[model samples]
Target chain A: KQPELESDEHGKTLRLTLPEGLSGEQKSQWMLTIKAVVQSAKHWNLAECTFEASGEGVIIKKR
Target chain B: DWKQPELESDEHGKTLRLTLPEGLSGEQKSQWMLTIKAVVQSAKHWNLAECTFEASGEGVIIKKR
Candidate 1:
């Protein structure tokens, strides 16, 4: 059916699920990059790009 | 020291543009491209999946299907 990657969205919101697909080490890299990118977006005052990381996932809202 | 990168995204989160100091084939190419692609995917552009990467004047451009 689908390919190696997949995703979901609602309005301008993007839901990125991690944790489950990762274990021990790999997850840390993704999580850290996600964390910093979110912060970078915030620092730019780019409301067109807002983000939230709730442990299991990262949600990006462009509203 | 690594130079900062330039990134541009459409409001719909469907298009992402990343500009590197040199061509993506340059020394820091992989670092810049992969990092940007990661964000591009999380934006729900269906990138890193169904999207496509096209080249342009300054750098690379990504568009969703």
Candidate 2:
């Protein structure tokens, strides 16, 4: 399922809803994974990285 | 001017480069390397199938499909 959008902040606060059927701990781990990517871009002061919904998963990358 | 990040990768593993902003001390650059390294490593562990750095045009990404 496509991730439901929560919000985003340029390269700052990039947030997205997790896929359905995940337990609470699963959600936390997934967020941890996503946060790793987001923190990396922030540390680099990147200006164009994004998190895009990709059907079953999200696509995080520089644009 | 563009900067080049120190890049290394194992066979079929991954490569990383940096375009560090100016005015960083050597120690700061090294610290940044640690941070970037952890991030890339986590990405690979999660689902980073392939990432290609390029000198021209946008870079590329290929997730496990």
Candidate 3:
């Protein structure tokens, strides 16, 4: 269940939403982020963290 | 980008687990496994390699790495 969302070609953005049931841990309480350039598949990376639910779009720290 | 090792599994469902020789960035050094539950009736395994639209979520294509 890889929830990957994408935008149109003009924007060139891919947004992925996590599924409710898929979690590596016992609890589903984390934010995972993955970024990559489409032209160069060799430079993809992902980051994940567990944080309390806040509305302000996950006040992202440079984890 | 990183590469996953060759995977193997048993009858219940497919599980791919590998040890990290070197640590993975900020995450602690621990056993890492990517599990793909099999749908035996349809003979289709959950595809983590591409954009998947199953009951759960979609799989994305990694163009760069």
Candidate 4:
């Protein structure tokens, strides 16, 4: 997650670190949290988030 | 930050928010207008007051501050 998070580490990067493993419902909750953060960031600053799919599940990170 | 500090609160009923690209004087103001086609899709008047304006994000965030 650290490597993927730092890809776009420019000025003022907000990295939203999620837990290692999460269930489907948990992932949805995480997504809602990220959405709130992204909306707030768009209202406050410039930041980006990405969801990557893997065997474990999807990873949510903001940078 | 919806609270107006240096700016004045919106006194009009109609308002819009848009993002305009760099460069452009008062050129597109007369050309482009916010044609808000208030289609009664919901079949409701919904207290509508239509107006038009150029796509300028500078003074678009018209929140009741």
Candidate 5:
């Protein structure tokens, strides 16, 4: 499994890198891990995640 | 204030540009700014918040926010 992770001070910014070839249940795991953390944030009333194909990676940020 | 809040990401990196529209009161802008800031703060609470802003590789996501 090829996965990359990056973040910023106070965890304001985060970038997750997953293999482009991943699909099906494999992809679902990635999404689950992300949502787990994202959903854990109780302070945020609204949140959003964006996906970009054929790019550097998928970026999940708060909106 | 000529632009709206936008999330931009590419091979270079991702950028959250917050721009209020014109003809808004100062309070409105401040509130909007707070909302944007909240989003950032909320993201920080996540474990994956340790990601970087560099555009090194490429991937895709299902939902775009």
Candidate 6:
């Protein structure tokens, strides 16, 4: 709930605020989101996802 | 809030919304949504074989393929 959202011409962005009091469980969820996004971020027209817990994931191509 | 940046799927909208972190930049937001799409697909399963994603709120939205 402590997230900051903004956008422009090139693209968009969101900031998932991380504070001291905030616990690490769900807060860490962004890790997967970030890692997955990053790994796929430069893939051009394809999408990719990678998760930690089970070490399970894959890539999706645009059609 | 999903209690912790949870992913809420709207069957009708055919979009996935994620409750996530609190920081990042414009492009970072893009990656964030893509990440959400990845996570959603990984979990409930994308169901986003071919899709378009964008950032929304403190989280993001993975619409559909």
Give the TM-score ranking, best first.
Answer: 5, 2, 1, 6, 4, 3
True contacts kept of 1: 0.03
Compose the digit string of candidate 5's lDDT tens values, residues A1-63: 222233335433333344444445444443443343334343333344432222222233444
Chain B alone vs. reference chain B, TM-score for every model: 0.33, 0.43, 0.26, 0.20, 0.46, 0.36
Models 1 onward score TM values of: 0.28, 0.29, 0.22, 0.25, 0.29, 0.27
Tell me the TM-score of model 6: 0.27
Q: List, residue by residue over B1-65, the lDDT tens digit for candidate 5.
A: 13323456677544443333334355533443343334344454433233322323443221212
Error of 4 at A1 (Å): 3.5
Q: Which candidate achieves the best DockQ against the true structure?
A: 6
Q: In model 2, where do residues sit more than 4 Å from their true spots? A: A1-15, A45-63, B1-65
* lDDT scores of the candidates, listed in order: 0.37, 0.36, 0.24, 0.24, 0.37, 0.40
lDDT of 5: 0.37
Error of 5 at B25 (Å): 0.9
Worst 10 residues of 2 chain B by lDDT: B53-62
Q: What is the DockQ of each candidate?
A: 0.05, 0.04, 0.04, 0.02, 0.06, 0.09
lDDT of residue A13 for candidate 4? 21
lDDT of 6 at B6: 25
Docking class of 4: incorrect
The C-alpha interface RMSD of every prediction is 14.0, 15.9, 15.4, 21.1, 15.5, 11.8
Query: Model 5 chain B, TM?
Result: 0.46
Candidate 6 is graded, for docking, as incorrect
DockQ of 1: 0.05
Which runs of model 4 end up more than 4 angstroms from their true locations?
A6-17, A46-63, B1-65
